[PDB]
Amino acid sequence: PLTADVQQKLAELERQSGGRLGVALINTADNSQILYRADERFAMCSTSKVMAAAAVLKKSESEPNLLNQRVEIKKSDLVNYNPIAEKHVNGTMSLAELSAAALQYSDNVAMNKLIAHVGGPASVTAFARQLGDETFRLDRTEPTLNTAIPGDPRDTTSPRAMAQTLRNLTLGKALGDSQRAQLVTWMKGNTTGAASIQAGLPASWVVGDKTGSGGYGTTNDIAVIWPKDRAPLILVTYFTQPQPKAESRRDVLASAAKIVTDGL
Ligand SMILES: *C(=O)C/C=N/[C@H](C(=O)O)C(=O)CCO
């Protein structure tokens, strides 16, 4: 996986941080991968929002507007973490606005609206299947999909599956050129990821990422990364802990990112 003192470094990091670490890096320069527990299941938490927004982008390829469609925001709709959907109670938001809100502020009402709109969690899972992702499963809505209970396969995927899917979505041809560019723009505009993968990368590198967090101190990040003068990287870092109310460890994701981008 590079020696494998990248593997030894990740093993150290995992053990030192006392949780379970999952990493999948794809280097598009030569198609190489660095994998650490990349076939184990992890709770996606808010990183699942990329798949929901992508499912909507894919449907917009056959429903030419779609992104302009308005969605009512109700008082009762508040799950709550929803920093954007609140400024529109008893108003509406477009699907474009809900996508942006879900992806860039991790708005949980926005996620629920995306899920509802494609047909529920099973239809988000079906979109993943149509992409050839056989591992992704979305089972619940916000906020329960973030429980992240050990042994619970609901709302999980593997780092390898999520890295390949994210590659196909942001760089490959899973989406139309227009829709791919929209997804990349949204993720590049993320506001929640400065302390996660980005914290472990040279400051000049451009990152589009989606974080996630949940029970058991689950701390996640999935990213497309353009180091300059370099071919892009896809990096998935998933991290979960054993105590139910463990605190977030976004620094572990930053360290994982440093480790696997070393030599690059
Ligand atoms: C996506 O990762 C955002 C979700 N965070 C969840 C929530 O919906 O409340 C949690 O933080 C659960 C407890 O950490």
Residue numbers in the entry: 25 to 288
Q: What text comes from the article?
A:
Cefotaximase-Munich (CTX-M) extended-spectrum beta-lactamases (ESBLs) are commonly associated with Gram-negative, hospital-acquired infections worldwide. CTX-M-15, which belongs to hydrolases (EC 3.5.2.6), cleaves lactam carbon–nitrogen amide bonds rapidly, deactivating β-lactam antibiotics. To understand the mechanism of CTX-M-15 activity, we have determined the crystal structures of CTX-M-15 in complex with two specific classes of beta-lactam compounds, desfuroylceftiofur (DFC) and ampicillin, and an inhibitor, clavulanic acid. The binding pocket of CTX-M-15 for those β-lactams was established by the residues from both the α- and α/β-domains, surrounded by the catalytic residues Ser70, Lys73, Ser130, and Glu166.
Inspection of the electron density map of the complex crystal structure of CTX-M-15 with clavulanic acid (1.4 Å resolution) displayed the cleaved N1–C2 bond of the β-lactam ring and the cleaved C4–O5 bond of the oxazoline ring. This was consistent for all three clavulanic acid molecules in the three CTX-M-15 molecules of the asymmetric unit. The newly formed imine bond in the opened-ring clavulanic acid was in a trans conformation parallelly oriented with the sidechains of Tyr105 and Asn132 but without any significant interaction with those two residues. The side chain of Lys73 was shifted toward Ser130, probably accelerating a proton transfer from the sidechain of Ser130 to the nitrogen atom of clavulanic acid. The sidechains of Glu166 and Asn170 also changed their conformation, approaching closer to the oxygen atom of the newly formed acyloxyl group, which resulted in a hydrogen bond network involving Lys73, Glu166, Asn170, and a crystallographic water molecule. Furthermore, the carboxyl oxygens of clavulanic acid established a hydrogen bond with the sidechain atom of Asn170 and the hydroxyl group of clavulanic acid displayed intramolecular hydrogen bond interactions with its own carbonyl oxygen. The bridged-head nitrogen of clavulanic acid showed a hydrogen bond interaction with the backbone of Ser237. In particular, the sidechain of Ser237 formed a hydrogen bond with the oxygen (O5) of the ring-opened clavulanic acid. The backbone nitrogen atoms of Ser70 and Ser237 created an oxyanion hole via hydrogen bond network with the carbonyl oxygen of acyloxyl group as observed for other acylated β-lactam compounds such as ampicillin and DFC. Based on the structural data, an inhibition mechanism by clavulanic acid could be due to first cleaving the b-lactam ring and then opening of the oxazoline ring.
